[PDB]
Amino acid sequence: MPDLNSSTDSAASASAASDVSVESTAEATVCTVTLEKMSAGLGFSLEGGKGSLHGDKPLTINRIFKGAASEQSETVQPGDEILQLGGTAMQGLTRFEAWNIIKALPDGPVTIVIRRKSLQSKETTAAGDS
Template identity: 40%
Template sequence: GPTNSLGISVAGGVGSSLGDVPIFVATMHPAGLAAQSQALEVGDQILSINGVSTEGLSHTEVDALLERASGNIELQVATRDDFADSLEENIMVGFTDDPRPLECRTITLERKSAGLGFSIVGGFGSPHGDLPIYVKTVFGKGAAFVDGRLKRGDQIIAVNGQSLEGVSQEEAVGILKRARGAVDLTVLS
């Protein structure tokens, strides 16, 4: 289980079994500071810890950063419902001026015979716990590649306005397969 004072364990990161995806909160110990402060949620992305960016780190390296951190821990996070309020307790969630904050946008892809051209990972009940749906691979042909905006690690929040929150990977695949013609993807990237 988690050995840091926040009581969280993380997943994702460079070289993870999900591919190179952002670092996110995988589990929270109910007695940990993070759970008690209610400012972090499972699935939140951790962008930096005490000013150290998690970009390009493995989850093992991020675990080590969290273990060494004590006292006031400043986390920059991107939550599924936009940005968290700052935490009380002795956790501070700080927002530095990140040059590219996570933004939610809509990408419309025209489904051709080759399909939408990307695969997904994560979802409710995944081997790594209940996660958001992430883009795993954008194939070298297909609508997503031609469009050029969808990237590996992007979180897909909704398809044609239908929220993917709480759906399994299988259900999300079904929703994407059933979508015909112009498909609106709401994406956090």
Template identity: 50%
Template sequence: MVGWAPGRDGVSPAPSVAELREFGLDEGHSASLNSSLSGLSMVSLISLVKDANGLGFSLDGGRGSLQGDRPLTVKKIFQGERPGGAEQLPDLLQPGDEVLQIGERSLQGLMRLEAWQLIRALPVGPVQLLVRKKGKP
């Protein structure tokens, strides 16, 4: 992408939902974005529906995790009947996928508890997530 420069650690910051839309991307679209000096990652903008139980997945990692500071990743996908096509959740998210952003809020540098509190504070309804798919360089 034009105008993107790596941060101090050599990793480019994740684009915001607004920046992805600026390049014509919307729900369900994917784009290869330069995430480091050494390769590309598949970053997807997906839409989920938050209900009273959350978004249908749990998180692992984060700042201060037992394994040290790590990106926030999907730990487990919850199965069951959920509104908004949650039966498709395993098609959109997989354990190990890195959650970069929820709505307009970046998760970079957050503790898992902080990310969980952010999700709990979201109103019930559609939510957009920016996700780096597992297994991509």
């Protein structure tokens, strides 16, 4: 298998990347950051509500603790819809099961990915606007 599949029914995933168009909606922004797994839960806990493949359980940070996120500004956010942690993806995980894979992660840089959409957002790069 050198390149994608070919010489057959034209059916090869293409999609694009790098460049993005179509501005977001309702003001949506993502904040990929790394936490430190050492306080037994990155000092943060996720709350939300699993569903049944028919609704949507956007786990979110509810109880953040003080004792981390000090190596690069605040790497945490309250009520943020974090989709995946340094090792757990909420979208394919229940609330408890989700916060469980993290706790079971190793002791290092836990990568968080949060997309805050809708009002309640103040970080549109205001440190130097033309």
